[PDB]
Design an enzyme around this catalytic site. Structure first.
Site, short mmCIF file in Angstrom:
data_model
loop_
_atom_site.label_atom_id
_atom_site.label_comp_id
_atom_site.label_asym_id
_atom_site.label_seq_id
_atom_site.Cartn_x
_atom_site.Cartn_y
_atom_site.Cartn_z
N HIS A 1 -3.18 -15.47 1.93
CA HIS A 1 -4.16 -14.57 1.38
C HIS A 1 -3.98 -13.15 1.87
O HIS A 1 -3.12 -12.85 2.75
CB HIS A 1 -5.61 -15.10 1.63
CG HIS A 1 -5.94 -15.41 3.05
ND1 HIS A 1 -5.86 -14.47 4.06
CD2 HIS A 1 -6.39 -16.54 3.63
CE1 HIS A 1 -6.24 -15.02 5.20
NE2 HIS A 1 -6.57 -16.27 4.96
C1 LIG Z 1 -12.26 -17.44 8.27
C2 LIG Z 1 -13.49 -18.14 7.80
C3 LIG Z 1 -13.38 -19.21 6.96
N1 LIG Z 1 -14.48 -19.87 6.54
C4 LIG Z 1 -14.29 -21.00 5.62
C5 LIG Z 1 -13.89 -20.42 4.27
C6 LIG Z 1 -13.02 -21.50 3.70
O1 LIG Z 1 -13.90 -22.26 2.85
C7 LIG Z 1 -12.49 -22.32 4.88
C8 LIG Z 1 -10.97 -22.25 5.11
O2 LIG Z 1 -10.53 -20.92 5.43
P1 LIG Z 1 -9.24 -20.14 4.84
O3 LIG Z 1 -9.54 -18.64 4.91
O4 LIG Z 1 -8.94 -20.75 3.50
O5 LIG Z 1 -8.14 -20.63 5.96
P2 LIG Z 1 -6.85 -19.99 6.78
O6 LIG Z 1 -7.03 -18.49 7.15
O7 LIG Z 1 -6.81 -20.81 8.01
O8 LIG Z 1 -5.70 -20.37 5.91
O9 LIG Z 1 -13.23 -21.87 6.03
C9 LIG Z 1 -15.80 -19.46 6.91
O10 LIG Z 1 -16.86 -20.04 6.52
N2 LIG Z 1 -15.94 -18.41 7.74
C10 LIG Z 1 -14.87 -17.73 8.20
O11 LIG Z 1 -15.09 -16.76 8.94
#
Ligand SMILES: Cc1cn([C@H]2C[C@H](O)[C@@H](COP(=O)(O)OP(=O)(O)O)O2)c(=O)[nH]c1=O
Ligand SMILES: Cc1cn([C@H]2C[C@H](O)[C@@H](COP(=O)(O)OP(=O)(O)O)O2)c(=O)[nH]c1=O
Lengths: 137, 138
Positions: free
Chosen positions: A51
């Site tokens: 992302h």
């Molecule tokens: C980073 C973060 C993620 N989340 C949730 C959002 C998504 O539904 C889930 C997975 O995060 P995601 O951003 O997809 O994972 P990564 O950076 O590890 O690849 O966690 C929160 O609720 N708060 C946060 O601060």
């Protein structure tokens, strides 16, 4: 080379009691810490991330073991291994990133300048590239 | 627990990619985060800590391995083991604590309401007791 990324070095206070690193907001990193989050117990075959952010400023820090971070903007890809708790990886807006080779016991901590906002993520690579090109070339 | 101490429970978003716990200042903890710090690579025989603060609010969190926290107020002690990254230990002002039994690979993360200020530390136990006695006694 790679825009909107820096490595930030923190204080490491090391003696016979162990190691300690302090991070003050706006002082040892450029932004206030509205939110933190940490990732743990990732299997070794996993790549997480995939992302970008339009507005968020974050600093990634690996506090145990090791993890590799793949950073992309158009026409450029860099890989940075994080394996020293006293070094932060600053990622500004419109960089795309991916985290892989989480070692056993790895701990990734992220410090972030805004509260969690799903609309600030770009999760489609084709949408990312589109938007990034307007900025970069 | 004691006065001015709490265990706080965080979101653990756990799936096939791992665990992620998010903490938003003022929301998942009761204060704004001005400083974090983290302790690592502590030998098995070390005790650290040995202080209290007058103003500082803090939250302690073990993100890997295990570590024990010894909490003191006057004539009351409790020992809390931290071993779950999704659990924070909030310690308010006028509580003395020490940290010990850091396991191999332990990481202790501390979230802090204020920037480092050495004058807010009480580092001598007798002084701690004198001051704290004011607070807690009838
Ligand atoms: C980073 C973060 C993620 N989340 C949730 C959002 C998504 O539904 C889930 C997975 O995060 P995601 O951003 O997809 O994972 P990564 O950076 O590890 O690849 O966690 C929160 O609720 N708060 C946060 O601060
Ligand atoms: C916690 C902290 C410590 N330090 C410095 C000052 C102290 O001499 C030393 C920290 O040790 P101290 O707080 O005495 O140890 P512990 O909490 O592990 O028992 O490092 C900072 O500069 N900033 C900080 O935020």
């Amino acid at each position: 080379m790679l825009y909107n990324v820096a490595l930030i070095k923190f204080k490491d206070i090391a003696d016979k009691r162990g190691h300690l690193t302090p991070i003050e907001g706006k002082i040892d990193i450029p932004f206030d810490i509205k939110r933190v989050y940490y990732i743990t117990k990732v299997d070794k075959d996993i790549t997480r991330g995939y992302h970008s952010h339009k507005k968020l400023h974050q600093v990634l820090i690996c506090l145990n073991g090791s993890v590799k971070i793949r950073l992309k903007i158009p026409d450029e890809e860099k890989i940075i291994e994080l394996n020293d708790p006293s070094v932060g990886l600053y990622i500004g807006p419109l960089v795309w990133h991916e985290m892989f080779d989480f070692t056993e016991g790895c701990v990734l901590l992220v410090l972030a300048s805004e509260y969690y906002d799903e609309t600030d993520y770009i999760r489609n690579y084709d949408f990312y590239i589109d938007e990034a090109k307007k900025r970069f070339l």
